[PDB]
Curated annotation (Swiss-Prot), chain B:
Note in the entry: Present with 8500 molecules/cell in log phase SD medium.
Assembly notes: V-ATPase is a heteromultimeric enzyme composed of a peripheral catalytic V1 complex (components A to H) attached to an integral membrane V0 proton pore complex (components: a, c, c', c'', d, e, f and VOA1). Interacts with RAV1 and RAV2 components of the RAVE complex, which are essential for the stability and assembly of V-ATPase.
Intracellular or extracellular location(s): Vacuole membrane
Range of the intact protein held here: 4 to 52 of 256
Similarity-based family: Belongs to the V-ATPase D subunit family.
Superkingdom of source: Eukaryota
Gene transcribed to yield this protein: VMA8
Phylogenetic placement of the source organism: Eukaryota, Fungi, Dikarya, Ascomycota, Saccharomycotina
Function statement: Subunit of the V1 complex of vacuolar(H+)-ATPase (V-ATPase), a multisubunit enzyme composed of a peripheral complex (V1) that hydrolyzes ATP and a membrane integral complex (V0) that translocates protons. V-ATPase is responsible for acidifying and maintaining the pH of intracellular compartments.
Name of this chain's protein: V-type proton ATPase subunit D
Swiss-Prot record, chain C:
UniProt source species: Saccharomyces cerevisiae (strain ATCC 204508 / S288c)
Note: Present with 131000 molecules/cell in log phase SD medium.
Family that this chain belongs to: Belongs to the ATPase alpha/beta chains family.
Protein name as annotated: V-type proton ATPase subunit B
Portion held of the full protein: 260 to 486 of 517
Compartments, record wording: Vacuole membrane
Residues that, per the record, bind ATP: R122
Purpose of the protein: Non-catalytic subunit of the V1 complex of vacuolar(H+)-ATPase (V-ATPase), a multisubunit enzyme composed of a peripheral complex (V1) that hydrolyzes ATP and a membrane integral complex (V0) that translocates protons. V-ATPase is responsible for acidifying and maintaining the pH of intracellular compartments.
Assembly, per entry: V-ATPase is a heteromultimeric enzyme composed of a peripheral catalytic V1 complex (components A to H) attached to an integral membrane V0 proton pore complex (components: a, c, c', c'', d, e, f and VOA1). Interacts with RAV1 and RAV2 components of the RAVE complex, which are essential for the stability and assembly of V-ATPase.
UniProtKB/Swiss-Prot annotation, chain D:
Deleted gene: phenotype: Increases the ATPase activity of membrane-detached V-ATPase V1. Abolishes growth at pH 7.5 and in the presence of calcium chloride, abrogates growth at pH 5.0.
Function: Subunit of the V1 complex of vacuolar(H+)-ATPase (V-ATPase), a multisubunit enzyme composed of a peripheral complex (V1) that hydrolyzes ATP and a membrane integral complex (V0) that translocates protons. V-ATPase is responsible for acidifying and maintaining the pH of intracellular compartments. This subunit is essential for activity, but not assembly, of the enzyme complex. This subunit is also required for silencing the ATPase activity of V-ATPase when V1 is detached from V0.
Effect listed in the UniProt record for changing D91A: Appears to have no effect on the ATPase activity of membrane-detached V-ATPase V1 or on cell population growth
Family: Belongs to the V-ATPase H subunit family.
Cell location: Vacuole membrane
Parent sequence residues shown: 320 to 476 of 478
Record note on quaternary structure: V-ATPase is a heteromultimeric enzyme composed of a peripheral catalytic V1 complex (components A to H) attached to an integral membrane V0 proton pore complex (components: a, c, c', c'', d, e, f and VOA1). Interacts with YND1.
Name of the protein in its database record: V-type proton ATPase subunit H
Note: Present with 22500 molecules/cell in log phase SD medium.
Top-rank lineage group of the source organism: Eukaryota
Swiss-Prot record, chain E:
Family designation: Belongs to the V-ATPase F subunit family.
Name recorded for this polypeptide: V-type proton ATPase subunit F
Membrane topology recorded in Swiss-Prot or TrEMBL: Peripheral membrane protein
Gene source species: Saccharomyces cerevisiae (strain ATCC 204508 / S288c)
Subcellular location: Vacuole membrane
The keyword Ion transport is assigned to this record: yes
Amino acid sequence: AFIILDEVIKVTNRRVNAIEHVIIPRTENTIAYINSELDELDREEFYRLKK
Amino acid sequence: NREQVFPTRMTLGLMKTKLKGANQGYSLLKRKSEALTKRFRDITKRIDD
Amino acid sequence: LTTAEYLAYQTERHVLTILTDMSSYADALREVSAAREEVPGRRGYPGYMYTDLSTIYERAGRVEGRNGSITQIPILTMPNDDITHPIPDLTGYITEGQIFVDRQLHNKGIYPPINVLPSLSRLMKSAIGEGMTRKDHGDVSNQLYAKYAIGKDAAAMKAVVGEEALSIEDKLSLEFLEKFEKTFITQGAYEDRTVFESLDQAWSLLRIYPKEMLNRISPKILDEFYD
Amino acid sequence: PTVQSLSERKYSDEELRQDISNLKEILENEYQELTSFDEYVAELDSKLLCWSPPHVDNGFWSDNIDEFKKDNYKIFRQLIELLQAKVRNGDVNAKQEKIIIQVALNDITHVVELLPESIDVLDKTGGKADIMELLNHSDSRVKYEALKATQAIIGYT
Amino acid sequence: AEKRTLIAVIADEDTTTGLLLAGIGQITPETQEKNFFVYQEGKTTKEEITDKFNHFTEERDDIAILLINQHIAENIRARVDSFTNAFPAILEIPSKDHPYDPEKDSVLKRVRKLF
């Protein structure tokens, strides 16, 4: 049970490795690019409205 | 990183919620790793003993 | 606003201002701004909205040489349950502190759903203490808030490893959170309880934990309050 | 002693014996609280101890001395269950837990000192090993109480 | 795991006799196979030891614990270290004329590292 407790602990650590610089950064980049695309589209529409 | 060309605004909410939630899940997995490490340590000293 | 202004500078009396459904007043201000047939700004709102709110929330304050003071506490609905809303973003940097509403606490069949995390006031420094409110106010407020927060952290941790792994501060925060949520949070529909009732109920509910279980308490306070 | 001997005695009538057990229980109900031994029972059940002269006062120790072991040292088992549970799991020494486990160490120490037959359990409950493992702690007070209990197990060999 | 209720043993004469005396030994009547085998350092070949190890560890779904003499375990320390599965649990124990070396136990060695 100790051995398995180590292996599973490693699994948890692996998740921590994926939830650190991987998932978090991916979500950050996705949110940023989506924010830029949406704000730019709104800027274009606002330009059409201004015209 | 990962970029999606076509986005609405709801997708931003789903990604943001999934991000915060995966963050909380990361915290849970971290504390769980701490406790499991302590337990496995005690079980290790007990194993040598 | 002029009505509150007349009872302060002239009539010289204590006044309190309350605005309801500021979101409808924002949409109304949107139609009124569109009445000038101007191209609207981001998300259909005037760019002068900062000044529009700046001529509104600036009607509150204390006047030098005048006994009568006017205080204002507006209310606004955040769009689509989002804090990114132009209304929330406008009143955010302008007004001092913000009182939010937790949709979880309202949908759980409980009393007033103000999230303890989000609840804050900038004048809280001048509204408490001996001679103002009570000497048991600030410290016990921070202690109860910390109890609710750590109680939530323990709520998530116990939702992970179970209740068999509950630690000292963890279980203490569990009881403190359950209590603060089902009691401290519970006020009433028309019910108004005195500040003394608040300090007493606070010390009594926080009494569930030991004397050393609260690191948010001062020694002088603990010796002159707990009884 | 009269209620104890009468409860240990026999009776032909059902009403006499039933009223005997009821009266003995009624006496033992408020007799245990004088000197409240139930006061510590609340701390054990709530698993939270404090600063009180419960194990410090010899009189209080003599009052609950007879209630220390009922069935297979039930009260003693309930006494060691808290420290053992504060050992195998959790076992984070800061503030509360430390002074509580230390108080439990001194109390269980006064108990083993009082009850010579209370040693046989500590070895089979894993309490000898947890007490010996309590020799090295973060706090000098916890280590002092734990070393006191170590010398206590060392008191009779 | 749930099927694992029997104990297999590979150890010297004294150990085998003691363990079998305790009542841990069992012979499957249908398969005519046994859960105990007396071992000799000089006579038993390494290939048979590795064979028995692999068979008891992977070929059987009913093995819960495998007992092994330290002296015997040293001969197949490679295969022992190679075993990383939680089941069967690995416990190195001493034998006659061969006291228990902590560092000799492959699993316990693994645990020792990173301590």
